[PDB]
Design a protein around this ligand. Structure first.
Ligand SMILES: [Mg+2]
Ligand SMILES: [Mg+2]
Lengths: 260, 260, 260, 260, 260, 260
């Protein structure tokens, strides 16, 4: 559909990467309800696209997402927040089966840091900054800003970032484990698109199985996690993609996958 | 009160930071029963102080805490450990609701490293060292020296430090995620006090809710953790400090919080 | 017994370290059925050796283990993999009670990285590389390559390595926490042997208790983990090595341990 | 919309109970795609109805639901099932916030038993029968027929019912804990409607909080469950309904609740 | 310390059973703060008594405990509950190491059922009734009335009792598993005292270990539960009472235990 | 091999049921090392038999298994027990993939009750009794007598049985959920054999998947349990038995399963 807050298009060769770019530069990509609706529409459109195998989520060069709109949430009481479940459409990225690579350039504060952490892979620029300033306005992060952050960077750094609201550099996020790669500002999007192309070049079903196996590490114990990983490695044998890849490996050539 | 092992006072402007400094320099701040009792009393006093919003725990410049007294625990038998629940008052720091910042200077060995890891934020000096030498005397760390350490720095480094008892530098704890900031020895205490002042400047109830949400990341799954975070974010709306902070954000000014 | 794929011997002074060296240099130490059988035989032999306290697992100078044989697993189906529990002998290293130090030199790809992550301590060379290329042949890592990796290095880096199959340097693994020490290619084995000698010098039963307490951090919550740690610290008092070590600490001398 | 497989209406005095009755008597209420879509639509309509406080789900007098259609799932392969998440709309009843009372009359086999167990309260007739015959056609229950059943009736009875497919009487389900009340066949619907009216008479928000607290018992440990229960009990104090109820208890009268 | 709400005495031969009888017959044993304080004092006194090995908690013949005083909690806000942690002294019974047998006669409503479920063994009379009427006053049970209840009687019956507030007979509680034995009203206390005497006649430390092993079933998985059970069965060997009991079993006689 | 403590044979028509009968009537089937070794040998022999689909474990008419040999473990210490892992060969029944039906007749005390609870289905005679008398000799059940028992029969009854050692009748175990069916002592074995034949007639791989899905209910949460159940129900589509059974159901006939 015609979006007014975001820009959705297919990038890279073979058109296998879906680029969802936030286009709110005057508000520093403020996460409003309309922007979230357009983002979810683009996400489901890219998920229902057979040619797309990976999604790249990015905002602006100076700001990825500076948090939710506060004026629409100031006059909310406890009843209207508990009932009606206020930030519920804020977790549709966690239900996406295809990998979503976050290209964080500039400010990723409040809701932006949570939306980035909800993605599988986070690519941060040279001047990218992460913070959780919810404590400054009398609230707490309520979209994964504490659960995923503490699991990623540890208790101490997450406790400091949550209780103080201070910002951390991209280098600190890489050393702590929040992001997996640091790229220049003018080439972050291109490297994220190349990584998404490398991801989508494989079998989509096996990639989804691997993503589920990785995500299960935060929901189950080590023994049950290993058992589920063994069951998934057994189940991946029932696909033609596994046999095709093993044939291309034994008889050295390029593997032609058909997502089945 | 008349303390013989620790020094308790309120530091910083407006006296919002409680400083609990171990005062056993000739014994390398050995964690004895009287010192633990005085630490618990000071923690309770600072918890029951409305003007205190954060606590800073520190020791000496050359040693933070070099472990418990071995003489008072050699004659102890298996039955006398289980019954009297040996080392039962060593986890009172985990029951505090206000944030406690550990300013570790010098040696933090055995019980000292566990007491530091039990704090929310760990500030270490340039010459600070962390180790678990329990394996050297025929015992294992029994106050969180294995659970929290493995969750913070990983399996490999924790296994090495536990089975070998070797010391790690402050830079190692920083790159591994054990500590959150490296500060000079002459200014570590003041930087910890400034961080505790920045923490106490916010709403104490919202800060405690955020601390609980962060601590829940080690006790529940990611889904249930996110559900509890959502419930806490919804409950935050029932406080006057939330509305005050959101109004101060809307009309740009300084938010005056009343801890309610 | 006489091995054809591996080399098993006791190294170090006092013969306290068991060295299991993979001896398949022309196949990059491919994890085959015979190699796994010989590895399990050497592991149980060293476990049934009262003079051995720690095991060092290493491969070649240019490759630790470059994955399993794809030829013996290409013609496998879903039923044959499930009704035979494929790769069920691949986790015998996780049942070892004595510490196992992984001296990873060169390539550790696929099954190699999984076998290395199952060890307690991972020692990597300067030119050591870790990767999970299973996604390139149409399968997923099914021997702990996702559960342990995501817990160690984090969500983002593990997701990238799994979905892309790209390699990471030893420095990246050290920064992310996958390995614990970087050593030269010419001395990595000697450093691992010295670490295993320092480990075996302590009480083997107390060392096993500490290893169990550390491993329990990935199978239980923080509260139950601390409770089990307290119970193990209480049970360690019923050993003769505990009082001997405490007496040697009180009256400064060398503690003579008898593994009881 | 106009339903062809189910009947949706508001029953009972004050029209606070939504009755969703399956209307496929010739197919023993086979769970097809259209019937599931209509059930989800009726559930959403009753959820978005302020005048409805509870839902009652029932079928026919001789059969509640005899499982899904096997014809629409025989020609399905593994890839079509996985890459489309077969039976994904079958768990929309677990996302409902208002209590759903299952009035099971007659046969509740496989999918019917799963849909009944997914409800909060199960009301069964004297001639009601429960079974999981999936093992007879070469499959396993895949909509909670093993997880919830084993947690409700125990390990032994669930194992027997799953591996044998034998039916159990309503008295057996009552003594095992599967159902909570046995009612005559001619009055089961009326008793379920009266129970839902007793439920709908209370505060909807407090009822939803209690439902969440009860459902959390199967998602985490007892300690975290009690902590979440304490937090929800504290959050209840921010509603006007709790104050109104406590005031009506003090000054003995009927409490007028407004769902806020 | 003379009590005004409860009666504390030692009953049974050898004076090994501590009887804590609620003595509020006009208020149906309303759980007030003073009664809770006296109960905690009696509990800690009986725990610190070497002659007492088991505790029996009971109220009146017509009422065990009819819930907390609503007048004390009527004028309480959300901030006053959270901060201050309302009902925080209500879980001191869960920290008792010695077994506590609940002799429930008459009404056990609201806080009474929660206090009874926190006991290890629950003994109910012929006319004993259990209910959770918190939903009738606009609140939810906040002292374990949902977590333990759902784990004991199942999902359906607990959901019904919570959302409706209806009472269940002692027979239904025995069938669902809430209680373990039904006794006449005039002899319930005597049978509970006899059971507590049978319990206290064994080794107190082994009894505490068994209680911990049983309570761990709700805090860990089956694998980790069995592991902790194995570790505790190994740890019980280091006590003299284990060897004494085994000697009395081999050489048939009466075992003389010394709680060590 | 020729057994001296047990009797192993194939019973029932088509020889699809393996009967492992304990043959120690003069010692009340005491669980000794040789008996456990022969039991494990018969179990692995029946597991490696393609014609056997289910195993029936029974003892004598007056005693199923009266616990382990006491004189075999009187002179054992804490170190000898921890380091040798006492009772480790006792959980080989939990690793069996095919269902094991426990035909418990007579006394099932101590280790016998644990071995019975480790089975999937428990069939008890009219005069069968279950108890955990470990507390009477100064020890605790260390082979699943507390974890599985508390999960099956509840907290109160398991606590009573563990702390008192009293016996429960077969009817009590049936109403509590410990056993699934009560049968006469003269026909219990035949009924268990008929049940195993009904189990063995189905697809062995699908039966193993169902057993795994049921056993996973005690190792994971409800959400992850349902996810693993969905994944197993998707994987079962890749078997030939699923399509054969579905075709036999569509066109009504007898399904011919080939265990593939
Ligand atoms: Mg890290
Ligand atoms: Mg039951």
């Amino acid at each position: 559909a015609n979006f007014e807050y975001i820009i959705a298009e297919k990038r890279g060769k073979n058109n296998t990467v879906g680029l969802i770019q936030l286009n709110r530069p005057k508000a520093l990509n403020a996460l409003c309800d309309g922007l979230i609706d357009e983002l979810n529409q683009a996400l489901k459109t890219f998920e229902e696209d057979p040619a797309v195998g990976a999604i790249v989520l990015t905002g602006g060069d100076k700001a990825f997402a500076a948090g939710a709109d506060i004026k629409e949430m100031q006059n909310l009481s406890f009843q209207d927040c508990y009932s009606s479940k206020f930030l519920k459409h804020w977790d549709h990225l966690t239900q996406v089966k295809k990998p979503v690579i976050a290209a964080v350039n500039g400010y990723a504060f409040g809701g932006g840091c949570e939306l980035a952490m909800m993605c599988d892979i986070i690519y941060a620029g040279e001047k990218a900054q992460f913070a959780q300033p919810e404590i400054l306005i009398g609230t707490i992060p309520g979209a994964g800003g504490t659960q995923r952050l503490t699991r990623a960077v540890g208790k101490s750094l997450a406790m400091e970032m949550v209780l103080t609201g201070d910002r951390i550099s991209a280098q600190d996020a890489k050393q702590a484990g929040l992001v997996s790669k640091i790229c220049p500002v003018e080439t972050l999007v291109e490297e994220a698109i190349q990584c998404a192309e490398k991801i989508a070049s494989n079998s989509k079903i096996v990639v989804a199985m691997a993503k589920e196996s990785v995500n299960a590490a935060f929901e189950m114990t080590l023994t049950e996690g290993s058992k589920l990983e063994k069951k998934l490695f057994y189940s991946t044998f029932a696909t033609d993609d596994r046999k095709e890849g093993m044939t291309a490996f034994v008889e050295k050539r390029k593997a032609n996958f058909k997502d089945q």
